[PDB]
Design a binder for this molecule. Structure first.
Ligand SMILES: CC(C)C[C@H](NC(=O)[C@@H](O)[C@H](N)Cc1ccccc1)C(=O)NO
Ligand SMILES: [Mg+2]
Ligand SMILES: [Mg+2]
Ligand SMILES: [Zn+2]
Length: 890
C-alpha cells in the first residue's frame, strides 16, 4: 500500500491563489470547468506539476490558453494528472480544465453526489479531487469564485460557500447562481448544494460589532417542520462563542442543510454546513429524545469549527486532532453549559472509556497525532476526536479559566487566516502557563507527549494517614504499556483533580485542588487533615487514564453516597461493579472449563445494593445520574479488563448480577417507575421546538431503564405497563415499549404497531430499525432476515444499513454466537457495502476491533472472516488499510 508519513511533510513547490469554478449540472452528467490562478513557491525546484484528480473524464486541459495534450504535455492515470515541467510556467499562470463527473452514480458519497433529489458535495478529506483537479491538501489555501447552473424546476435552490453575487436565467429552463467566498480556505471546506429545498430563517445580530447575520436552515419539503430546533441550537452556538470566547461569525449568511444520504454526522464547510438529516432534523412527535442532544452537539460542533478548523486550519492531515479534538472540547463546554446536567459529561466519559480505551489497547492504537496513513478517512477516530478532546480539556484544568482563555486567544489571534500545527497550540498554552506560574522558565515540553505517545496511562494510588501529625499522603504511580508505536513509554503530565471526604460525616475536608503528576511516581502530602479521609480522585475525570483507586468497596459506597463530584460517585459505582464482574466472571469460567457439577458465586455486596436504593429514593439526585447507577458498565469497558474474554461467560455474569440486584430492588424500581410518570411525561413544550427540558428527558431515560430491568425480570403484571407505555405520545417511550416487549409474546404485535407509527418519517423508521436490531430476542437472526427482505431491501442509504446491523453487533450473546454466524453475517455486509461505499464498509467493521481480546475460538472465527474480507478482489484502500492494521499486518 501507498503510505504518507508525518515526518515527510514539506511545503508545495506551487501556490494556488484563486479558484474559479462553473458547475453545470444536467440529468446524466455534470460538467465542471475550473480555472486555477497559480504561481511558483519559494520551494519550487523545477518539478513536474502534479494534480490530484480521481475518476474525472477530461474534456480539456490548458495553461495560459495553450491546449495540453495527453502523452505529450501531460499524463493522467485516473488518480494524478502530471504536467511535465517543461510546460509549467516559471511565474504566475492560469491552469484551465474541464471535466465530466456523475453525481447521479456516485454512491460513495464523497465528492459530488445525489442524495434523493438533492445534489450535494462532501470534500473532507480527499473528496475535492473527485470534483476537479487540485493539489488536494489543506495547506493549499485559495479564494473561491463558484457558479452553479441547473434545471430550475428540479433545482430551484443553488448554494455555495460565501456571498451570493448574481442569479440569472439561462435558456432551456435552466438557471445559475454565483458565489464569492472572501475567506482563504483549503479545498476540503468547499461545498455546493442544488435542490428543491425549503427553509426557515432568522436574523442574528452579533454581540460586539452588531453585524446582521442571516441564518438559514434547509431540508426537503416533506421535513421543513423538523428544522426549528437546529436553528435555535445555531443561535445558542453563536451566543456561546461570543460570550465565552469572544468570537463572532464572519460572513453575512450561514446556511445549514440536511441531506438524507451522508457518511458521517455533519461537515463544517464555510458558511454552508451540511448535515446527515439525523443530526439536523427533529420533531417531538417524530423523534426520540436523544435527537435533541445530538442536534445540539452537531450544530454546535460544526459552528465552532468556524474558528477552530476554518479561520485557523490544518497544515497537514496529521494535525487533524488540532481541529477535531479542540472542537469536540469546545462543543463539550457548550453542551455542559446548555444542558446543565451531569449526564452530559458522564456520557462523554462513558464513550471514551468504552470505545476509545478499547481502540487504544487494540492493534489499531495510535497517538492523537498519527505518524502515518494510507487513507486519511481511517483516522477520523475516537482517539483523535475523544482522547483529543480530553487532551484539549486538560489545558483548561491545568491553567484554569482565566489563563486558558488567554492561551486560546493567543492561538486564535496568531494563526488567524492561516494553517497551524499541534505545536502552535501547545506554544500558545505554554505562554499562558509561563504567565500563570509567574516564571518564564516553565514550559510544556512534556505535554507534547500527549500528542505523540499512544496508549492509555494507568494511574494507581497508595494512602497513608498519621493521626498524631494530622498528615495524609497520596502516593501516585503512572504506567503506560509499551506497544507498536513506542517500545519505551514516558511519563505524561497528568493533572489529578482531588478532594477529600470525611467518612464519618460525609463532608469535604479541603478546597478542591489539582495535583500535577509529571514523574513516574510522586507523593503528595496534606497537612491539617483532621481524620483519615476517603480520597475523591480524578474529579470530573481530569485526565484520560485507567484509574486504580485502591479503595475498598466500603470506601467506594461512601463516596457514591456522599461525594460532591458526579464523576467520582459514578466511578466508585463502576469500580464496585467491575470487582463483582471480574470475580463472578472467573467463577463461571472455572466452572465451564473444569466442567463442574456445582460451584459458588460471590453475591453482590448487600451494602452496595442498599446504597443504590438510597440514591434511587433521593429526590435531589439527577435522574440521569440514577440511570447510570442501575446499569452495569458497558461491555466494551469491561473487555479492557479481561484477556481471552469468553462472551457467553460474560453474558451469564451480567445476568447474575442484574438478577441479584433486582431480587432486592424490583419493588423500588416499580414504585419509582410509577412515581416518575407525571413529571416525566408532562407535555409542557410538546409543541415548542425551541425549548427542551433536559432534566425531563433524563427522567424519561430513567423510566425506560427501570422498565427494561422490570421486563427482563418478568415483574408481575409488567406487560400491562408496557402496553400502556406503547400509547405514549413520546417516541422514546413507545419505542422502548417495543424493546422491552422482547421478553413477552406481545413482541410481534408491538413490532407491527410501532412499524406503522414509524414508517412515514424516514428518520423515525431508522430509529425503529435500530430498536428492532438491538432487541433481546432469541430469534434475532430471523428478525434481521425479515428486516433485510421487508424494509432495508437494496437501500444504499448509510443510515438504513447502519440501523439494521450495528445495534445487533452489540448483542453479546447472539452476535458472538460460537458458530461464528454473527461474524459471517457482518463480514458479508461489509464486503457488499465496500463495492459502493468504502467509508461505510469500514464503519461496519467496528465489532471486529476487539478480536484479539476474545477467547481463542472467537479470535479464530473473527480472524478467518477478516482475512476472507482482505482476499476480496477490488477491496478499497480504506477497508484494506483498516483490516491490515487491525490484523497486525501493517
Ligand atoms: C463529533 C461530531 C459532533 C460530529 C462529527 N463531525 C465532524 O467532526 C465534522 O466536523 C468532520 N469535519 C466531518 C468528517 C469529514 C471527513 C471524515 C469524517 C468526518 C461526525 O460527523 N460524527 O458522525
Ligand atoms: Mg467519474
Ligand atoms: Mg430512503
Ligand atoms: Zn469536526
Amino acid at each position: 500500500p501507498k503510505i504518507h508519513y508525518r515526518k515527510d511533510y514539506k511545503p508545495s513547490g506551487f501556490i494556488i491563489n484563486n479558484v474559479t469554478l462553473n458547475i453545470n449540472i444536467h440529468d446524466n452528467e455534470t460538467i465542471v470547468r475550473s480555472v486555477l490562478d497559480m504561481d511558483i513557491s519559494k520551494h519550487n525546484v523545477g518539478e513536474d506539476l502534479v494534480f490530484d484528480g480521481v475518476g474525472l473524464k477530461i474534456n480539456e486541459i490548458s495553461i495560459n490558453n495553450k491546449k495540453l495534450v495527453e502523452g505529450e504535455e501531460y499524463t493522467y492515470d485516473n488518480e494524478f494528472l502530471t504536467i511535465f515541467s517543461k510546460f509549467v510556467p516559471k511565474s504566475k499562470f492560469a491552469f484551465s480544465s474541464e471535466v465530466i463527473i456523475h453525481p447521479e452514480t456516485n454512491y460513495a458519497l464523497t465528492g459530488l453526489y445525489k442524495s434523493k433529489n438533492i445534489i450535494v458535495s462532501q470534500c473532507e478529506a480527499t473528496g475535492f479531487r473527485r470534483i476537479t483537479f487540485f493539489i488536494d491538501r489543506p495547506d493549499m489555501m485559495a479564494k473561491y469564485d463558484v457558479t452553479v447552473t441547473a434545471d430550475k424546476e428540479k433545482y430551484p435552490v443553488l448554494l455555495s460557500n460565501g456571498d451570493k453575487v448574481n442569479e440569472f436565467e439561462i435558456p432551456g429552463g435552466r438557471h445559475g447562481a454565483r458565489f464569492n467566498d472572501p475567506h482563504l480556505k483549503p479545498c476540503y471546506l468547499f461545498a455546493v448544494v442544488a435542490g428543491d429545498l425549503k427553509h426557515l430563517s432568522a436574523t442574528y445580530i452579533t454581540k460586539y460589532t452588531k453585524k446582521k447575520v442571516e441564518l438559514y436552515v434547509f431540508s426537503e419539503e416533506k421535513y421543513v417542520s423538523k428544522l426549528q430546533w437546529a436553528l435555535e441550537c445555531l443561535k445558542k452556538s453563536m451566543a456561546f462563542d461570543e460570550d465565552y470566547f469572544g468570537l463572532e461569525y464572519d460572513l453575512s449568511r450561514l446556511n445549514l442543510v440536511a441531506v438524507s444520504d451522508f457518511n458521517v454526522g455533519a461537515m463544517e464547510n464555510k458558511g454552508l454546513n451540511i448535515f446527515n438529516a439525523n443530526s439536523l432534523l427533529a420533531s417531538k412527535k417524530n423523534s426520540i429524545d436523544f435527537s435533541y442532544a445530538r442536534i445540539l452537539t452537531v450544530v454546535g460542533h460544526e459552528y465552532f469549527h468556524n474558528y477552530t478548523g476554518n479561520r485557523v486550519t490544518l497544515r497537514d492531515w496529521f494535525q487533524l486532532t488540532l481541529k477535531e479534538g479542540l472542537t469536540v472540547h469546545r462543543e463539550n463546554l457548550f453542551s455542559e453549559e446548555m444542558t446543565k446536567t451531569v449526564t452530559t459529561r458522564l456520557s462523554h466519559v462513558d464513550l471514551l472509556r468504552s470505545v476509545q480505551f478499547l481502540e487504544d489497547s487494540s492493534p489499531l492504537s495510535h497517538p492523537i497525532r498519527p505518524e502515518s496513513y494510507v487513507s486519511m478517512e481511517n483516522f477520523y477516530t475516537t482517539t483523535v476526536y475523544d482522547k483529543g478532546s480530553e487532551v484539549m480539556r486538560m489545558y483548561l484544568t491545568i491553567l484554569g479559566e482565566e489563563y486558558y482563555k488567554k492561551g486560546f486567544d493567543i492561538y486564535i489571534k496568531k494563526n488567524d487566516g492561516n494553517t497551524a500545527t499541534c505545536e502552535d497550540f501547545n506554544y500558545a498554552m505554554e505562554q499562558a502557563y509561563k504567565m500563570k506560574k509567574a516564571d518564564n522558565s516553565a514550559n510544556l515540553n512534556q505535554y507534547l507527549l500527549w500528542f505523540s505517545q499512544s496508549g492509555t496511562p494507568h494511574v494507581s494510588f497508595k494512602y497513608n494517614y498519621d493521626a498524631e501529625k494530622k498528615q495524609y499522603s497520596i502516593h501516585v504511580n503512572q504506567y503506560t504499556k509499551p506497544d507498536e508505536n513506542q517500545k519505551e513509554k514516558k511519563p505524561l503530565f497528568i493533572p489529578i483533580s482531588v478532594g477529600l471526604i470525611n467518612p464519618e460525616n460525609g463532608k469535604e475536608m479541603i478546597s478542591q485542588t489539582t495535583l500535577e503528576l509529571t514523574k513516574e511516581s510522586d507523593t503528595f502530602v496534606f497537612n491539617n487533615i483532621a481524620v483519615k479521609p476517603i480520597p475523591s480522585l480524578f474529579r470530573g475525570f481530569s485526565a484520560p487514564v485507567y484509574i486504580e483507586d485502591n479503595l475498598t468497596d466500603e470506601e467506594r459506597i461512601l463516596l457514591l453516597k456522599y461525594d460532591s463530584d458526579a464523576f467520582v460517585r459514578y466511578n466508585s459505582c463502576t469500580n464496585i461493579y467491575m470487582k463483582q464482574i471480574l470475580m463472578n466472571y472467573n467463577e463461571f469460567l472455572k466452572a465451564k472449563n473444569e466442567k463442574l457439577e456445582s460451584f459458588n458465586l460471590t453475591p453482590v455486596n448487600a451494602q452496595f445494593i442498599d446504597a443504590i436504593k438510597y440514591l434511587l429514593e433521593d429526590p435531589h439526585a439527577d435522574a440521569g445520574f440514577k440511570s447510570y447507577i442501575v446499569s452495569l458498565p458497558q461491555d466494551r469497558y469491561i473487555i479492557n479488563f479481561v484477556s481471552n474474554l469468553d462472551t457467553d461467560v460474560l453474558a451469564d455474569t451480567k445476568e447474575y448480577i442484574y438478577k441479584q440486584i433486582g431480587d432486592k430492588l424490583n419493588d423500588v424500581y416499580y414504585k419509582m417507575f410509577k412515581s416518575l410518570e407525571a413529571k416525566a411525561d408532562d407535555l409542557t413544550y410538546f409543541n415548542d421546538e425551541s425549548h427542551v427540558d433536559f432534566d425531563q428527558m433524563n427522567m424519561r431515560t430513567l423510566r425506560n431503564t427501570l422498565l427494561s430491568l422490570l421486563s427482563k425480570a418478568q415483574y408481575p403484571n409488567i406487560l400491562n405497563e408496557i402496553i400502556e407505555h406503547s400509547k405514549s405520545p413520546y417516541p422514546s417511550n413507545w419505542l422502548t415499549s417495543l424493546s422491552v416487549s422482547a421478553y413477552f409474546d406481545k413482541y410481534f404485535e408491538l413490532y407491527d404497531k410501532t412499524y406503522k407509527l414509524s414508517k412515514d418519517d424516514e428518520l423515525l423508521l431508522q430509529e425503529w430499525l435500530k430498536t428492532v436490531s438491538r432487541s433481546d430476542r432469541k430469534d434475532i437472526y430471523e428478525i434481521l432476515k425479515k428486516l433485510e427482505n421487508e424494509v432495508l431491501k437494496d437501500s444504499k442509504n448509510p443510515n438504513d444499513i447502519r440501523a439494521v446491523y450495528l445495534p445487533f453487533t452489540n448483542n453479546l450473546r447472539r452476535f458472538h454466537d460460537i458458530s461464528g454466524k454473527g461474524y459471517k453475517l457482518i463480514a458479508e455486509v461489509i464486503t457488499k457495502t465496500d463495492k459502493f461505499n468504502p467509508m461505510v464498509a469500514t464503519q461496519l467493521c467496528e465489532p471486529f476491533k476487539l478480536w484479539n481480546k476474545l477467547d481463542t475460538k472467537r479470535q479464530e472465527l473473527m480472524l478467518n472472516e477478516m482475512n476472507t474480507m482482505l482476499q476480496e478482489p477490488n477491496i478499497s484502500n480504506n477497508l484494506k488499510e483498516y483490516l491490515l492494521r487491525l490484523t497486525n499486518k501493517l
